[PDB]
Amino acid sequence: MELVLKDAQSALTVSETTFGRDFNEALVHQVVVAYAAGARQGTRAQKTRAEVTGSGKKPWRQKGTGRARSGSIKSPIWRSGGVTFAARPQDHSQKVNKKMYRGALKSILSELVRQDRLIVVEKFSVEAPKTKLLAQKLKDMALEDVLIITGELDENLFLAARNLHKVDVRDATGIDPVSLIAFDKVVMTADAVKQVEEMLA
Partner RNA sequence: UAGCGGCGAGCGAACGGGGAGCAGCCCAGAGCCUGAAUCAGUGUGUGUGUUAGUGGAAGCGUCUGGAAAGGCGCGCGAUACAGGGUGACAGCCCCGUACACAAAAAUGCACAUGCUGUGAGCUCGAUGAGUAGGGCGGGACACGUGGUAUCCUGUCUGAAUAUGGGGGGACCAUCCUCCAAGGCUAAAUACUCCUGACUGACCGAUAGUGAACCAGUACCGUGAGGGAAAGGCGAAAAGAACCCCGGCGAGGGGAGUGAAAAAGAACCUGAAACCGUGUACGUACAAGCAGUGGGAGCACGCUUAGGCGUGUGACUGCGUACCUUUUGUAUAAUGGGUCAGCGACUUAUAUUCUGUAGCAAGGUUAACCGAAUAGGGGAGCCGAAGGGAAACCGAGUCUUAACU
Chain residues that interact with other proteins, rule: CB under 8 A = 23, 25-26, 28-30, 32, 108, 111-112, 115, 178, 181-182
The site partner of 62 among Mg ion, other proteins, RNA, none (C-beta below 5 to 8 Å per kind) is none
Does residue 99 bind RNA (CB under 7 A)?
Answer: yes
CB of 173 to other proteins, least distance (A): 22
Picking from 124, 171, 129, the residue whose alpha carbon sits closest to that of residue 143 is: 124
Total residues interacting with RNA, rule: CB under 7 A: 60
Toward RNA, which CB reaches closer, 122 or 168? Answer: 168
Q: Give which of other proteins, Mg ion, RNA, none residue 71 binds (C-beta under 5 to 8 Å, depending on kind).
A: none
Measured from the Cβ of residue 147, the count of other Cβ atoms closer than 10 Å reads 22
Gap between the Cα atoms of 139 and 24, Å rounded: 33
Query: Helices (H), strands (E): how many in the chain?
Result: 7, 6
**Residue number with CB closer to RNA (10 or 42):** 42
Q: Give the residue, chosen from 2, 9, 16, 41, that forms a contact with RNA under the rule CB under 7 A.
A: 41
The 3 state secondary structure assigned to 105-162 is HHHHHHHHHHHCCEEEECCCCCCCCCHHHHHHHHHHCCCCCEEEEECCCCHHHHHHHC
Return the H-helix or E-strand segment holding 27: helix 25-39
**Alpha-carbon distance 191 to 55, whole Å?**
68
By CB under 5 A, the residues from 51 to 90 that bind Mg ion are 80
Q: Per rule CB under 7 A, is residue 92 in the interface with RNA?
A: yes
Interface ranges with RNA (CB under 7 A): 24, 26-27, 30, 35-47, 52-55, 73, 76-77, 79-81, 83-85, 88, 90-93, 95-103, 129-132, 135, 159-160, 162-165, 173-176, 199
